[PDB]
Amino acid sequence: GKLADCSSKSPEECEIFLVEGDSAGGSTKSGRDSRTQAILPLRGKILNVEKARLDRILNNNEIRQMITAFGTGIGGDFDLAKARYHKIVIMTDADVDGAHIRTLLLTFFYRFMRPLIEAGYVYIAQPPTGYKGLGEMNADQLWETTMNPEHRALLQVKLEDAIEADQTFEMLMGDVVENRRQFIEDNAVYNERNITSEMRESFLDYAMSVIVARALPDVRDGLKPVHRRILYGLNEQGMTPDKSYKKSARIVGDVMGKYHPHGDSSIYEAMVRMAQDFSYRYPLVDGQGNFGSMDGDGAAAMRFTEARMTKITLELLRDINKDTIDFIDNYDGNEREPSVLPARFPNLLANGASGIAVGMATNIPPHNLTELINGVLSLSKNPDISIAELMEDIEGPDFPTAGLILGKSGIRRAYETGRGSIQMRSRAVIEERGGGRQRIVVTEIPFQVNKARMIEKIAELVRDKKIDGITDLRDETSLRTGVRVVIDVRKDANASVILNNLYKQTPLQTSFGVNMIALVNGRPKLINLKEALVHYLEHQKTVVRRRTQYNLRKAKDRAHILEGLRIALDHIDEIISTIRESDTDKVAMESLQQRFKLSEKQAQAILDMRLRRLTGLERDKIEAEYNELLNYISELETILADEEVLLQLVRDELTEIRDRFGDDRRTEIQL
Amino acid sequence: KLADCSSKSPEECEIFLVEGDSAGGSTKSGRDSRTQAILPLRGKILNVEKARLDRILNNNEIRQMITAFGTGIGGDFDLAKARYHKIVIMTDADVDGAHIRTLLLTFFYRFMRPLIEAGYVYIAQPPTGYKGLGEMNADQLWETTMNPEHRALLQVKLEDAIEADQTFEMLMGDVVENRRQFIEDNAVYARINERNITSEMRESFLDYAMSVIVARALPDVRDGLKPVHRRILYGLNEQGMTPDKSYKKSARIVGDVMGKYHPHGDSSIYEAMVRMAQDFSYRYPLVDGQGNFGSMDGDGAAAMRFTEARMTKITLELLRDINKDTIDFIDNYDGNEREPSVLPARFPNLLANGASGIAVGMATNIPPHNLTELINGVLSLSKNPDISIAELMEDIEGPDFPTAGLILGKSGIRRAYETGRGSIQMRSRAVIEERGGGRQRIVVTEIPFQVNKARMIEKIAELVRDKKIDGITDLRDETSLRTGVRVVIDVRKDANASVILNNLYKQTPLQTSFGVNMIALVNGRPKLINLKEALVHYLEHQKTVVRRRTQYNLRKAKDRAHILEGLRIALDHIDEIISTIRESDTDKVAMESLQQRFKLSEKQAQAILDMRLRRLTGLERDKIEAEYNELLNYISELETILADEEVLLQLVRDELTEIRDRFGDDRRTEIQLG
DNA sequence: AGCCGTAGGTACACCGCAC
DNA sequence: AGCCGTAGGTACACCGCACA
Numbered sequence A: 001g002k003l004a005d006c007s008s009k010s011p012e013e014c015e016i017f018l019v020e021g022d023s024a025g026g027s028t029k030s031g032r033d034s035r036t037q038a039i040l041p042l043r044g045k046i047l048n049v050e051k052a053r054l055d056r057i058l059n060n061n062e063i064r065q066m067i068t069a070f071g072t073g074i075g076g077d078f079d080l081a082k083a084r085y086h087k088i089v090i091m092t093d094a095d096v097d098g099a100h101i102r103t104l105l106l107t108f109f110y111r112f113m114r115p116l117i118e119a120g121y122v123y124i125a126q127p128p129t130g131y132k133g134l135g136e137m138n139a140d141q142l143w144e145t146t147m148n149p150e151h152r153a154l155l156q157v158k159l160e161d162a163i164e165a166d167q168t169f170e171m172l173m174g175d176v177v178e179n180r181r182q183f184i185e186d187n188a189v190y191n192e193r194n195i196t197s198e199m200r201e202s203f204l205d206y207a208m209s210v211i212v213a214r215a216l217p218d219v220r221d222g223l224k225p226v227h228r229r230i231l232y233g234l235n236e237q238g239m240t241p242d243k244s245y246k247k248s249a250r251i252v253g254d255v256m257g258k259y260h261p262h263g264d265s266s267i268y269e270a271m272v273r274m275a276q277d278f279s280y281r282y283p284l285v286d287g288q289g290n291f292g293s294m295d296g297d298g299a300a301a302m303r304f305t306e307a308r309m310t311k312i313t314l315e316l317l318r319d320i321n322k323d324t325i326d327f328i329d330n331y332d333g334n335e336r337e338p339s340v341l342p343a344r345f346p347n348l349l350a351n352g353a354s355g356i357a358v359g360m361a362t363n364i365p366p367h368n369l370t371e372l373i374n375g376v377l378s379l380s381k382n383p384d385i386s387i388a389e390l391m392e393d394i395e396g397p398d399f400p401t402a403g404l405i406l407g408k409s410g411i412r413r414a415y416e417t418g419r420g421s422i423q424m425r426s427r428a429v430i431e432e433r434g435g436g437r438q439r440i441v442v443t444e445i446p447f448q449v450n451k452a453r454m455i456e457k458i459a460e461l462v463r464d465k466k467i468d469g470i471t472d473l474r475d476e477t478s479l480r481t482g483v484r485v486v487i488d489v490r491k492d493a494n495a496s497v498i499l500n501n502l503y504k505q506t507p508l509q510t511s512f513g514v515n516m517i518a519l520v521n522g523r524p525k526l527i528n529l530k531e532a533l534v535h536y537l538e539h540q541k542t543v544v545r546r547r548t549q550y551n552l553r554k555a556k557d558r559a560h561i562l563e564g565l566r567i568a569l570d571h572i573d574e575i576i577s578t579i580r581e582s583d584t585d586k587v588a589m590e591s592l593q594q595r596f597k598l599s600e601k602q603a604q605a606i607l608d609m610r611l612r613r614l615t616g617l618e619r620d621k622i623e624a625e626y627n628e629l630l631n632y633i634s635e636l637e638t639i640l641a642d643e644e645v646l647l648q649l650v651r652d653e654l655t656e657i658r659d660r661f662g663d664d665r666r667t668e669i670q671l
Numbered sequence B: 001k002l003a004d005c006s007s008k009s010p011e012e013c014e015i016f017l018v019e020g021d022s023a024g025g026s027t028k029s030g031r032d033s034r035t036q037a038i039l040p041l042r043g044k045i046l047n048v049e050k051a052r053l054d055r056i057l058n059n060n061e062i063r064q065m066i067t068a069f070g071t072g073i074g075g076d077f078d079l080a081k082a083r084y085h086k087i088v089i090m091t092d093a094d095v096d097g098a099h100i101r102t103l104l105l106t107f108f109y110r111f112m113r114p115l116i117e118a119g120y121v122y123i124a125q126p127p128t129g130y131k132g133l134g135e136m137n138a139d140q141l142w143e144t145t146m147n148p149e150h151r152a153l154l155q156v157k158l159e160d161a162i163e164a165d166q167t168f169e170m171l172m173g174d175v176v177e178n179r180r181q182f183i184e185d186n187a188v189y190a191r192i193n194e195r196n197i198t199s200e201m202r203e204s205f206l207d208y209a210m211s212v213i214v215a216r217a218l219p220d221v222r223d224g225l226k227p228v229h230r231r232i233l234y235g236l237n238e239q240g241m242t243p244d245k246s247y248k249k250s251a252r253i254v255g256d257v258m259g260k261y262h263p264h265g266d267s268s269i270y271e272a273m274v275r276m277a278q279d280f281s282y283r284y285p286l287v288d289g290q291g292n293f294g295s296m297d298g299d300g301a302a303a304m305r306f307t308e309a310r311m312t313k314i315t316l317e318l319l320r321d322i323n324k325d326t327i328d329f330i331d332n333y334d335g336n337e338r339e340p341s342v343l344p345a346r347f348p349n350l351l352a353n354g355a356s357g358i359a360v361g362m363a364t365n366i367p368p369h370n371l372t373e374l375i376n377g378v379l380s381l382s383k384n385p386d387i388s389i390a391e392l393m394e395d396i397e398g399p400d401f402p403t404a405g406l407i408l409g410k411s412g413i414r415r416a417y418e419t420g421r422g423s424i425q426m427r428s429r430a431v432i433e434e435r436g437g438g439r440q441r442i443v444v445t446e447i448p449f450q451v452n453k454a455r456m457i458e459k460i461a462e463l464v465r466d467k468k469i470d471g472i473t474d475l476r477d478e479t480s481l482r483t484g485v486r487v488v489i490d491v492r493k494d495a496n497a498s499v500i501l502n503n504l505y506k507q508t509p510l511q512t513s514f515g516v517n518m519i520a521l522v523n524g525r526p527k528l529i530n531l532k533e534a535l536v537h538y539l540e541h542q543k544t545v546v547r548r549r550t551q552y553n554l555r556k557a558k559d560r561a562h563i564l565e566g567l568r569i570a571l572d573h574i575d576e577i578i579s580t581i582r583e584s585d586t587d588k589v590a591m592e593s594l595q596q597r598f599k600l601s602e603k604q605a606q607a608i609l610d611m612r613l614r615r616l617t618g619l620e621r622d623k624i625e626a627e628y629n630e631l632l633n634y635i636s637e638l639e640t641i642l643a644d645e646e647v648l649l650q651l652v653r654d655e656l657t658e659i660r661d662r663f664g665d666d667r668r669t670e671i672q673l674g
Numbered sequence C: 001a002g003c004c005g006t007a008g009g010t011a012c013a014c015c016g017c018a019c
Numbered sequence D: 001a002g003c004c005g006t007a008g009g010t011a012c013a014c015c016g017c018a019c020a
C-alpha cells in the first residue's frame, strides 16, 4: 500500500492526489491536509491500457493500487456508490512528461472507470510552471498554489461527446501510428475542462517536445539535445583532449544543472555511448574506465569513470565562441546553450542516429568520413549533382563494426527516397581444424548486434535441433586478438550449408532499415542523401561567414585600441602631463580625449596601461601587433567581398579535416 | 551471476571475485576467457562469524560462491570437486575493499578451510590510486593484475590453526571489547608470493578499522564534524554558495564534493547534506534547503536532481577566517586538490549540534545543546580553568534537542557530563483535554529526538490491535504546516487518561532514552571525554584560530606597508621612474635599474612596474600616504594583541559573545526535575 | 515478438555498536 | 529487536516506432 490515506471516511469531502513518485509525494504529504487529502504516489509513466492486453492491465501494480484506493471496482463491476473519494486529482509534474502521464492516466480512467469521469469526480491540479517536479517545491508553496481549496484552481474533467472521446483515445493512444502522425502534422505549431481537449493539448505538447527536443537529431550537426549538451558542457569546462580526464559525476552534475533538466542516467548513458568504438563510427567522447562491451554489459557507475573530448569533437566545437551559431536561453533562464554546434564535419551521416519519437522514428546509418567530405566537395562544385553521381563518392554506410553489406539496391533506395533496407552480414570464414574437421570463424558482426545474445541464439537452435551440423560454440574474443566466434562443424557436414542456415536463422545476418528523418529548420523531415548534404554545406557556409565577420569586428576594435596606444607612445611625455595635472580619473579621461582627439575607449586603454608597457620590447610589441592586424584585416575583407573565395575556404577547411581524420572503409560492399 | 571460463580443466582455471559489476566489467573485458571466470559480488558480504547458519545459507552471494566452487561446505567439503584451483579475491584497492577481503576470508576459513590449506585461495594486488576496478581500463587491469606473466598474486597460507581461530574470533566475532582492545594496542596514528592468513586479517582489518575511526564515523572535537560534512561545507564555501547568493543545484554540489574531496557514493554525500538541512535533526541547521528534504515520518529527500541548497547564516561562522591561515590544509585523496583538516568553527559545534556514529570497536552518541548556554559555559571556563562540571552546569543545564520535549531528572545528565556516559530519559510533550460528551483525548505536540513519528504511531496502533493496552478508541496524526506536530489519542469514555498515557510512555517510543557516549577525535585519536574536556579542547582551538588570524593579518599588513613605501618613492620621483623604464629594453633590466637607482626591493620594483597610468592622478599621492599611516596604526594594534595573552583571550570572548547575541536562542527542551 | 535509445519513476541486500 | 548514520554494492517497472 503506497497510499497515504486521510483521516475522514466521508467520501463527499475526501480527496486523493495522484503524484509521479516519492520525490513529489514528500512535498505533497508535507503540505496536505491529512484530514481530507489522501496521496497515492505512482512510479512514473503508467501502462497504456489502450495498447495493452486485458490480462496484463489487471496484473499491473499501479493499476491495482489505484483501483484498490478508489474502492469502485472496474468496467462493469464499477459501483459509483463505493467510491472512497469524491475528488480524484491528477497532479503529475509540470513538464512534458507530466502531461504525457496525465494522458496515460486519463486513458485508464476513461476506459475502466468511465462513470467516475461522468460523475464529475476527476480533476486536474495546476502546479506552477518552472519546476521540474513537485519535489522541487517547498511544502507550503505547493499547498497554497495547488492544494489549498481557498486558492487552488482545480480543473474538473467533463465528458461532452462520447463518440468524439472514443475517436480521440483511439487516435492518440491506439496502436495505429499513422493516425497519430497525421494528428501531429495537422496540428503542429513550431475551470471545467473537456477531456477531449485536454488529451489533444497534453499529448501534442508531449509529442512535439519529444519530436523537436529529444528523440530526433538536427540535420546540421547531427545531434540530439542530450548529446549537444554533454559536448557543450565538456567545452565549457575546458575538457579538451590535451587536458587530463575529468570525473564523470561532475560532467553529469554540470550538464544536468546547467542544460539538461532530466535524470542522470539518461545523461550518463548518452555520454557512455559516444565513447564506445563499436557504437560510434567516430567516437565523440574519450572515456577512461569501464565503458561497456559489445556483449551488452553496461558501463561502470559514474563515480568510477572519467572522460574528455576526442580530437574530432574539437571539430564539432571549433569556433563556437566566435558568434558562429545562435545561443538560446536554457530551460530556466539562468544559462545560455547552443542551438546548434559549428560541426566542421558532416556528423549526422558520419555517426548516424536512431531515435524512437512520437508518431515517427529515425534510423540513419554511419558513413565513412573520407567519402562524405568528398561528397560535400562535389556538391559544392555542382548544385545540380544527382544522387547517382554523389554515390560515386559515398558508396554506402560504413559501420564501426565493419562486416559486409549485400548488394547496392537497398543503399540506392535509401539514398534516393530516405527509406530502404540494407542487408548486413558478419564476416565469416570456413577453415580446417585437424583430422578432416572444419569450423566457422566469425571476426566481425553486424552493427548494433549484441554478440553474446547472438551466440545464445545459435546455441538455442543447436539445442532445439532447429539446426544441424554444429558440435561446439565458443566466443574466443579477446582484447589482444579481437572478435572471434568459433562454430565447430560435425565431421563431413557441409559447413557452407551450415553457414548459410545461420544467416537465415540468426542475427549473423541482420538488416538495417534506413529511415532518414531529421530536423530541418526545426521540423522533422524525411530526407534523401542529397538533401542531407545540402543542408550540411549550407550550414558550413553560414559558420565560416559568421566566423570571418566576427574576427573582423574584433580585429577592428583591437586596431582602434592600438591606434590609441601608439598616439600615447608617440607623446608619452605629454600624456603623463595630462594625467598628472588631473584630480580624478574622469577629469584625466576627458582631458586625454580633448588634447589628443582620442575615443572614450582609447583614453580608457591608455589610463589602464601599466608602466611595464614602456620598456623597449613592449613598445615594439604594440607596433608589431598593429601591423600584423592590418594585414589580417584585409585578408578577412577579401573573403567577405567574394562569395567564391568564401566557399573555397569552406572547401579547404573541409579538405584539411578529411586529411587528418579520414580513414579506411571498414564495411565491405559485396556485389 | 557467474561469467565462467571455456576450459573445464580445474587445474588451469581461476575465478576472480570482484565487488560488483563496475569492477566486473573491466575484469571481463580484460580477462583470458579460456581460463578465467569472474564472479561479481554485491558489496559488503555477510560476516559469517556473527551469523547463524540459516542466515548464511540464504545469502545470495554465499550461495553463488558455493555453487561456483562446486566443493560443498563444512563437513561435506570435497576438494576434488573444485571447479577452480585458484580462487582470487580481487576487491577494490580501498579500505572498504580490504574490509570485503576480510569478510570473504572469514567465510572461506569457517566453511571452506581445506580450500585454504591446499593453497587454492589467492589475493590479487590491483594498483592503488583507483577507487574501483571500473576506473581502470581493461588492458591496465589485465597487464598489472590478471596476466600470469607479470601479475603478483598472493597465495594465502595457514600457518597456525590455533592462532587463526583466535584471530577470526577477535576481529570478526561479536565481542566488541576484544576488537576495541586489538585496535588500541595496534593503532598507529602517524609483497611477492606467500601471505599468512593471520597477518592479512590483522593488517587489513586494522586498516579498515583505523580508517573508519579517524576518517568517517567519528566527529572531531574542535569543529564537531566528520569528514563528509566537512567536505560538504567546504564545497559550499569554495563555490561561494553563501546565504545571500541564490540556491545552488544539489546535483552540482554533490558531484563537486564527490570529485574533489569525498571519493565515495553519492548517497552518503547527499543524505549527509540533507540531514544538515533538517530542522528536526540539527539543533542549528548547517544547510539551507529548497524542495523536499524529508520529514520526521522518515520520508527521505526528493532525488537530488530536484533539490537545491546553500549555507545557512550560522555555517559562515564555521567557515569564518578559513582563508587567513587559521587552519591547516591537507592534500585531497588524489593530490589534485587541497582540503581543510579542520574548520575554524567560531561556535562550539560539537556540542551544539551533537553527533552519533557507529565505527569499529566503538561508537559515539553526543546530544545537541543550546548555543546560548554553551557559549556562557565556554566564557565561564575561560575565566576559570579550574571550573568544575557542577559549576559548568549553571550555564549548560542539559541537552537541548531540535524536537524539544521533556527530559526526566538531572542525574542522567550529570553522569553524562562528569564521565562522558549516561542515560537521559526523554519524554514527549503530552496533555489531556476534553473532546465532548465527557470524553477526553491525549494530544502529543512534541516527540523525542531521533524518533520517527509515523513509526511511533504504528507501534501504538499495534499495541491496541494486540490488546496489550486498553482504553484507546482512536489514533490520528493531525500534524500540519499550520498546526505543527499534533498526534491525537482518543480515550474511551470514563477511562483514566493519565494511566493510559503512563502506559504509552513505558510501552512505546513516546518516551525514549538517549544513551550518551561522548567519544570524539582529540589530536586524531578517539577519546571518551566529559563536558569539561570538550569545552577545553574547543576553547584551545579558538585561541589558536584567533592567534593565527592575527599573525596572518600582521604579515599581510607588513607586506602592504613595504609595497606602499616603494609606491611613495616612485610617485615622488615619477619622472625619473618613467625615464628609467623607457630607457630599459626588457623587464629584467627595468627591474635591476629601479632597484639600484631608487633603493628598492624586488617586490617594490615589481609593484611600480605593474602600476597603471591612472594611478598618477593628482589625489593619489595623498591617498597612498593616508593608507600607509593607517597601516602603521593597524600593525601596532595587532602587535599589542600578540604581546599579551589576556588581550587575545578577551578577543576570543568578545567574538564568542557576539556569536551568542546574534545566534543564541531560547531553550526548547524542558528539564523537569524528579 | 523483442530490441534499439532517451525519457518518467523507485528498493533492498550488507558492515559496524549500543541499549 | 531493530534503529540511529556513513560506507560497499546493484534492477526493474513504464512510453514510443519500425522491422524480423
Ligand SMILES: O=c1ccc2ncc(F)c3c2n1C[C@@]3(O)CN1CCC(NCc2cc3c(cn2)OCCO3)CC1
Binding pocket: A249, A250, A252, A253, A254, A256, A264, A265, B251, B252, B254, B255, B258, B266, B304, B305, C010, C011, D010, D011
Ligand atoms: O541499482 C539499483 C537497483 C535497484 C533500485 N531500485 C530502486 C532505486 F531507486 C534504485 C535502485 N538502484 C539504484 C537506485 O537507487 C536509483 N538510482 C538513484 C540515484 C540515481 N543517481 C543519483 C545521482 C548521482 C549524481 C548526480 C545525480 N544523480 O549528479 C552528479 C553527482 O552524482 C541513479 C538511480
Ligand SMILES: [Mn+2]
Binding pocket: A020, A093, A097, A098, A132, A133, C008
Ligand atoms: Mn516527473
Ligand SMILES: [Mn+2]
Binding pocket: B019, B092, B096, B097, B131, B132, D008
Ligand atoms: Mn568498491
Ligand SMILES: [Mn+2]
Binding pocket: B504, B505, B506, B507, B508, B509, B510, B511, B512
Ligand atoms: Mn518507552
Ligand SMILES: [Mn+2]
Binding pocket: D001
Ligand atoms: Mn538480532
